[PDB]
Paper text:
In our previous studies, we examined various combinations of amino acid substitutions in motifs A–E and found that the HBV-RT-associated 3MB mutant comprising Q151M in motif B and Y115F/F116Y in motif A is useful as a surrogate for structurally studying HBV RT since HIV-1 harboring RT3MB turned out to be highly sensitive against typical anti-HBV NAs, ETV, and 3TC. The present study aimed to elucidate the mechanism of potent antiviral activity of E-CFCP against wild-type and drug-resistant HBV using HIV-1 with HBV-associated mutations in RT.
As a result, the structures of HIV-1 RT3MB and -RT4M complexed with DNA:E-CFCP-TP were determined at resolutions of 2.62 and 2.70 Å, respectively. Chains A and C, B and D, and E and F correspond to the p66 and p51 subunits and DNA, respectively. The clear electron density map enabled us to construct a complete atomic model of the bound E-CFCP-TP at the HIV-1 RT3MB/4M N-site in both chains A and C. Nevertheless, the average B-values of the final refined E-CFCP-TP model were relatively high (100–110 Å2) compared with those of polypeptide chains and DNA close to the N-site (~ 75 Å2). In addition, the superimposition of the four chains (chain A and C of RT3MB/4M) indicated that the bound E-CFCP-TP varied in conformation with an RMSD of ~ 0.5 Å, and the electron density peak for Mg2+ was absent in chain A of RT4M. These observations suggest that the bound E-CFCP-TP is slightly perturbed within the N-site of crystallized RT3MB/4M. The fluorine atom is located midway between the Met184 and Asp185 sidechains with interatomic distances of 3.5–4.0 Å; the fluoromethylene pushes the Met184 sidechain backward and fills the gap between the Met184 and Asp185 sidechains. The 4′-cyano exploits the deep hydrophobic pocket created by the Ala114, Phe115, Met184, Asp185, and Phe160 sidechains. Superimposition of the bound E-CFCP-TP, ETV-TP, and dGTP in HIV-1 RT3MB/4M highlights the deviated binding of the cyclopentyl moiety of E-CFCP-TP; the cyclopentyl moiety is shifted approximately 0.6 Å toward Met151 and skewed by approximately 10°.
Numbering used by the authors:
A (entry chain A): 1 to 553
B (entry chain B): 5 to 213, 231 to 427
The structure:
DNA sequence: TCGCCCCCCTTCGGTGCTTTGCACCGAAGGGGGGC
C-alpha cells in the first residue's frame, strides 16, 4: 500500500529543468520483469501513465536481488539527480553489533517494497518520466511517472528514512523499554519482556506500521537466533560476521588487490592482527585497474599471515553498561597498529586497526596518539563514552615527549602494558651544548634556476667539506649538510644550521619519513649518543655560519 | 512582533557542516533541551529537504551544573549580512577595560521572544545524533532569534537598550557591553558591592526574560633577555638571533658589536668575554624592550589575530596583533588546576581567557593560531569549553626558532 | 549503464609561507560493508 503520510516537498536546483534522455535496449527477462511490475505498480497506484506533453524522460533497466527469484527495478536518474536540490542526509553512521546490550527476546523485521510505499511530492512527479522498451525494435514504449519514491533518485533514501522516523515515533515513546534499531527499512527489536509479551508488542508494532502503509512480510520476519543483521549473525551471548571469502588467484591485477585489501579491512573489526601495508604498497604508482601486479615477497608473507588469522573462528560479545570499556593497542611495525576493545579479559567487543601515515615525517608516539584518537572517536560513536586505555608506552617516555615537544598534546587515563615491542623515543636532542663535542657549522646552498647545489660544513676543531649536489632544492641541500655533519662526527656532536626548515623537522624527533634523505638522517641520529642542534640567522656574518656560507658560495 | 528581513551575503549559501559524535550525556541533554524548545515553539522539527546543517553540542559548567545547548554558528555568522552595514551593530565602550571587576552574564534566553524572518530560518538547521546510530539524525530549525547567531544581538538591540536604561541611569558609572549572547558588566566597587548590583541587574532581567574578571591584573609580558656575568658562544648566538628577530618589531636595535665577538669558527662552549662595546649594545637594547612599542594602534576595520606558544610547566605565551610584528598586546597565561597534566585543557582555557580579554578590550574575538594538531584539538576541546561563543581558529606547527617570549 | 551511508588506501590539486618547494588538507578515485 501507499502511506497516507504527507509528502516531502522537493525542488529542482534554481535555473534548471528536468531530464530529457532517450531509452536504451534490454533483454527478455528484464522487460517482462518490469512490465510484470509496471502494470502491477500501476494497479497499486505506484506509477501513472503519461504522454507527450510531458517533455521529460529518463532511461530504465532492472537488477537482480538477493531474493534472486525476485527482480529489482532501477531507473538511471543520474541527470535528474544532478538537477535535483541538495538534501541533508540523516543517516549519520552505521550501527555496530558491539554496541548492542544482551536482550532476552529479539526480533528482526523488514518492510516490503519500502520506497514504493512513500508517496512523492505531486509537483515533482513529472520529472520522473520514463519509457518502457519491450525488446526495443518491437514497439514505441509506454510512458509512466512515479507517484512514490523511485529507486535510483537522489532524494528517496533520505525522504524514506525521515518518513520511517515519523512513523516509528509514536511507538518508540509509548514503549521506551524496547530497543528499536532502525536502519533503512530493517528493524531490530529487542526487549527484556518474556517472549509472550514480546510477541504481543511486535504484533502491535507490525499493525501500527500497516495502518501507515508499511507491510512486514513473513519472509523477512526472523523470530529465532541466529539473527542475520547488517552483515552479522546475532547469537544470545555472542556475535559473528558472515563468512569472509578472500580472492585466491594465480595472477593478481590492481583491481584484485584493491578487492583483497577491502575484505581484510572489513575483517579487522573482529579479527585481531590483520595487516594490509605490504599489500596496499603494490597499488602505488600503478596506472590501470587491469594492470597485472606481481606480489612482492613481503606481500605474500602478509597475505599468508592474514589467511592464518581468518582460518580460526572468532566472535564479539555484547555491551555491558555496568562495566568500563578497555582499549588495548599493540604496535605491529612500519606504522601499523591493531587494537582490541573489551570489558572482561579475553572477550573482545571488537577489534580494529590504524595504519595511516599523516604527514611526511612522524614518529611512533605521534601515531600512537592518533590511534588513541581514532579509538576514542569510535568509542563515542558506538557506546557514547571513551574507554580506559592500556598502552605499550612507559610513563617516562610519554613524559619526555610532551615536555620537549612544542605542540600541546594529551592522552586520557591509561595504564602501561608490557607487550613488546614498546613505543619509545628513538633519540633525544640535547637541551644544552655538549662540552668536549666537536662543533659543526653546516650550510647548504642550491640555485633555484640551476638545479645544482652544494652542501658542506666547517669545524672548530678543523674539518671542512663541500660536496656538489645535482638535481636538488634549497631545502634538500640544507638537509644534506646536516647529513654530512652527522656522517663525519663522533658519537657526540654540536651542529649549527641556518635553516628553520631543517631544524623544525629534526626537532620533532621523527623516527620515519617518506623522504629517503630524512630517513638517512634519522638512522644517524639514533646511532649517536648526544646531539645538540642550534639555529642562527643566515647572512649576518656570525662566526662559523659565515665561513661555511663563504665556502658553499 | 514583525520580523526584520535578513539576507546572507551576496553569492553565499547557508552552512553545510556535518554533525560530529557526542557522548551519551550530551545527547540526552540536547534531547531534553530541544523537546522542550519544540513545545514552546522556539524550534520546529524539519526533514532532509532543508539542505543546511550546523553542528550542535552541549557544555555544562560546574559554575552551574545545568547543561547549556551550544550551536556552533561560526559558519552561518561568517555568511550573514553585516549589521553595522545596516545601522544596527552595537558600539563597544572604551570604559569597560578599566573597571575594577567585570562580571559576565548569559542573557541569550532573551532572544527567544523575538521571531526570526521565516525565510531565514532554514539556515539555522541542526541535527541531534544517535548512540550507535540506533536512529537517523533528528533535525530542527529555529523560529526565534537563535543563541550564537550574530544577528540576534543586532535585531534585539533596541529592545535590550530599553530593558537596561533604568539600570544605566540609576547606576551611571557602570558600563555594560553586550557581545553575542553575553553581557559584560563592570564597575568599581567591593566584590560584595559589585555582586550587589549584578544581582539587582539579574532580577530586573528576570522581570521580563560565572567568573569575576579583573582587567588591571592582565599584565603584559615584554621580551626579556637573560642575565649572567659569563657568556658562552652559544649564549651569544641565541641572543644575537633573538634580537635579530626583535628588529622586525622594535626600532634601532643593533647586533654589529655582538656579532663579531663570535668572529671565527669558535666552539659552542667557549666562554667569550664581553667587550665594553658589547655590554653597551646589550644593556641598551635591554630596555628598548622594557617599555613597549611606538606607533601601533588598533584598527576596528581589521581582524584581530592571536598566537599562542607552549612554554612548559603550565605556562603559555600569547600575542594579539592585526598586522604582523605590530602587537597590540603580549601576555602569558598560567594554570594550576591541581591535576597538573592536561595540555589540551590548558590551551582551551587559555583561548577562552584570551578571547574574553579581546572582547573586553576591543569588542570582538581574535582568530586563533593554535599550536596543536587539528585532530588532537577536535578530539577533546569541547570537554573544556565554557563560553557561549566560539572564536575562529586555525592550526599551525611553528617550531620554536626563537623563544623570545620566554 | 541507478540511489544513500560508514570505513580504508592512494592520488590530486588548492593554499600559504615574510616560499621559489614544501607540508598540510579536503576531495575524489578505487575497494570493503550495510539497505
Ligand atoms: N527502503 C528501502 C530499500 C530496501 O531494500 P530491500 O533489500 O529491503 O528490498 P525492498 O524493501 O525494496 O523489498 P523487499 O523487502 O525485498 O520486499 C532500499 C534501501 F534501504 C533501497 N535499495 C536497496 N537496494 C538498492 C539498490 O541497489 N539501488 C537503489 N537505488 N536502491 C536500493 C530500495 C528498497 O526499498
Amino acid at each position: 500500500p501507499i502511506s497516507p503520510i504527507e509528502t516531502v516537498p522537493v525542488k529542482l536546483k534554481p535555473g534548471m529543468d528536468g531530464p530529457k534522455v532517450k531509452q536504451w535496449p534490454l533483454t527478455e527477462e528484464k522487460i517482462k520483469a518490469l512490465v510484470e511490475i509496471c502494470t502491477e505498480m500501476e494497479k497499486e497506484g505506484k506509477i501513472s501513465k503519461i504522454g507527450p506533453e510531458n517533455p521529460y524522460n529518463t532511461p530504465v533497466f532492472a537488477i537482480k536481488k538477493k531474493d534472486s527469484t525476485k527482480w529489482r527495478k532501477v531507473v538511471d536518474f543520474r541527470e535528474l539527480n544532478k538537477r535535483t536540490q541538495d538534501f541533508w542526509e540523516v543517516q549519520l553512521g552505521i550501527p555496530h553489533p558491539a554496541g548492542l546490550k544482551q536482550k532476552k527476546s529479539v526480533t528482526v523485521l523488514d518492510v516490503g517494497d519500502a520506497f514504493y510505499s512513500v508517496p512523492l511530492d505531486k509537483d515533482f512527479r513529472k520529472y520522473t518520466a520514463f519509457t518502457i522498451p519491450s525488446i526495443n525494435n518491437e514497439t514505441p514504449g509506454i510512458r509512466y511517472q512515479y507517484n512514490v519514491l523511485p529507486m535510483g533518485w537522489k532524494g528517496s533514501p533520505a525522504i524514506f528514512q525521515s518518513s520511517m522516523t515519523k512513523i516509528l515515533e509514536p511507538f518508540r515513546k509509548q514503549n521506551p523499554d524496547i530497543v528499536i534499531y532502525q536502519y533503512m527499512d530493517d528493524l531490530y527489536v529487542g526487549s527484556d519482556l518474556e517472549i509472550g509479551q514480546h510477541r504481543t508488542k511486535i504484533e502491535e508494532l507490525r499493525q501500527h506500521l500497516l495502518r501507515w502503509g508499511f507491510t512486514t512480510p513473513d519472509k523477512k520476519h526472523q523470530k529465532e537466533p541466529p539473527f542475520l543483521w547488517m552483515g552479522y549473525e546475532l547469537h544470545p551471548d555472542k556475535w559473528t560476521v558472515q563468512p569472509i571469502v578472500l580472492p585466491e588467484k594465480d595472477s593478481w591485477t590492481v583491481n584484485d588487490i584493491q578487492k583483497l585489501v577491502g575484505k581484510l579491512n572489513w575483517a579487522s573489526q573482529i579479527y585481531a592482527g590483520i595487516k594490509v601495508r605490504q599489500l596496499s604498497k603494490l597499488l602505488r604508482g600503478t596506472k590501470a585497474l587491469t594492470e597485472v601486479v606481481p606480489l612482492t615477497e613481503e606481500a605474500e608473507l602478509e597475505l599468508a599471515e592474514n589467511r592464518e588469522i581468518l582460518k580460526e573462528p572468532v566472535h564479539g560479545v555484547y555491551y555491558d553498561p555496568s562495566k568500563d570499556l578497555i582499549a588495548e593497542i599493540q604496535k605491529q611495525g612500519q606504522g601499523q597498529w591493531t587494537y582490541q576493545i573489551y570489558q572482561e579479559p579475553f572477550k573482545n567487543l571488537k577489534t580494529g586497526k590504524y595504519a595511516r601515515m599523516k604527514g611526511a615525517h612522524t614518529n611512533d608516539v605521534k601515531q600512537l596518539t592518533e590511534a588513541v584518537q581514532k579509538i576514542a572517536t569510535e568509542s563515542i560513536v558506538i557506546w557514547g563514552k571513551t574507554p580506559k586505555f592500556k598502552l605499550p608506552i612507559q610513563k617516562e617516555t610519554w613524559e619526555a615527549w610532551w615536555t620537549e615537544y612544542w605542540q600541546a598534546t594529551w592522552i586520557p587515563e591509561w595504564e602501561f602494558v608490557n607487550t613488546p615491542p614498546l613505543v619509545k623515543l628513538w633519540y633525544q636532542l640535547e637541551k644544552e651544548p655538549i662540552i668536549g663535542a666537536e662543533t659543526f657549522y653546516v650550510d647548504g646552498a642550491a640555485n633555484r634556476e640551476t638545479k645544482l647545489g652544494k652542501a658542506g660544513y666547517v669545524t672548530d676543531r678543523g674539518r671542512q667539506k663541500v660536496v656538489p649536489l645535482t638535481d636538488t632544492t634549497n631545502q634538500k641541500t640544507e638537509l644534506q649538510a646536516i647529513h654530512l655533519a652527522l656522517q663525519d662526527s663522533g658519537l657526540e656532536v654540536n651542529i649549527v644550521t641556518d635553516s628553520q626548515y631543517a631544524l623544525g623537522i629534526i626537532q620533532a624527533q621523527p623516527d620515519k619519513s617518506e623522504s629517503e634523505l630524512v630517513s638517512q638522517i634519522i638512522e644517524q641520529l639514533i646511532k649517536k649518543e648526544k646531539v645538540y642542534l642550534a639555529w642562527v640567522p643566515a647572512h649576518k656574518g656570525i662566526g662559523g655560519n659565515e665561513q661555511v656560507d663563504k665556502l658553499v658560495s | 512582533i514583525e520580523t526584520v528581513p535578513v539576507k546572507l551575503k551576496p553569492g553565499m549559501d547557508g552552512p553545510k557542516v556535518k554533525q560530529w559524535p557526542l557522548t551519551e550525556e550530551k545527547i540526552k541533554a540536547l534531547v531534553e533541551i530541544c523537546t522542550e524548545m519544540e513545545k514552546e515553539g522556539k524550534i520546529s522539527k524539519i526533514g532532509p529537504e532543508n539542505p543546511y546543517n550546523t553542528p550542535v553540542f552541549a557544555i555544562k559548567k560546574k559554575d552551574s551544573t545545568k547543561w547549556r545547548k551550544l550551536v556552533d554558528f561560526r559558519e552561518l555568522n561568517k555568511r550573514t549580512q553585516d549589521f553595522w552595514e545596516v545601522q544596527l551593530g552595537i558600539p563597544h565602550p572604551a570604559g569597560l577595560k578599566q573597571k575594577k571587576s567585570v562580571t559576565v552574564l548569559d542573557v541569550g534566553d532573551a532572544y527567544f521572544s523575538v521571531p526570526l524572518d521565516k525565510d531565514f530560518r532554514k539556515y539555522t538547521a541542526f541535527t541531534i545524533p544517535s548512540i550507535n546510530n540506533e536512529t537517523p539524525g533528528i533535525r530542527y530549525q529555529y523560529n526565534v532569534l537563535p543563541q550564537g547567531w550574530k544577528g540576534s544581538p543586532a535585531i534585539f538591540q533596541s529592545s535590550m537598550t530599553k530593558i537596561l536604561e533604568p539600570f544605566r541611569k540609576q547606576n551611571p558609572d557602570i558600563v555594560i557591553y553586550q557581545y553575542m549572547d553575553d553581557l559584560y558588566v563592570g564597575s568599581d566597587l567591593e566584590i560584595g558591592q559589585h555582586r550587589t548590583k549584578i544581582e539587582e541587574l539579574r532580577q530586573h532581567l528576570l522581570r521580563w526574560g560565572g567568573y569575576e574578571l579583573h582587567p588591571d591584573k592582565w599584565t603584559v609580558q615584554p621580551i626579556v633577555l637573560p642575565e649572567k656575568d659569563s657568556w658562552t658562544v652559544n649564549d651569544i648566538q641565541k641572543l644575537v638571533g633573538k634580537l635579530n628577530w626583535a628588529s622586525q618589531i622594535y626600532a634601532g636595535i643593533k647586533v654589529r658589536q655582538l656579532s663579531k665577538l663570535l668572529r671565527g669558527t669558535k666552539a659552542l662552549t667557549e666562554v667569550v668575554p664581553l667587550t665594553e662595546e658589547a655590554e653597551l649594545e646589550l644593556a641598551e637594547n635591554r630596555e628598548i624592550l622594557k617599555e613597549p612599542v611606538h606607533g601601533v594602534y588598533y584598527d576596528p576595520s581589521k581582524d584581530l589575530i592571536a598566537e599562542i606558544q607552549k612554554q612548559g610547566q603550565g605556562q603559555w605565551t600569547y600575542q594579539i596583533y592585526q598586522e604582523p610584528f605590530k602587537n597590540l598586546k603580549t601576555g602569558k597565561y598560567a594554570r594550576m588546576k591541581g591535576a597538573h597534566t592536561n595540555d589540551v585543557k590548558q590551551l582551551t582555557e587559555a583561548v577562552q581567557k584570551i578571547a574574553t580579554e579581546s572582547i573586553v578590550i576591543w569588542g570582538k574575538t581574535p582568530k586563533f593560531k593554535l599550536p596543536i594538531q587539528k585532530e588532537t584539538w577536535e578530539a577533546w576541546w569541547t570537554e573544556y569549553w565554557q563560553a557561549t561563543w566560539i572564536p575562529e581558529w586555525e592550526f599551525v606547527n611553528t617550531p620554536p626558532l626563537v623563544k623570545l617570549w620566554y
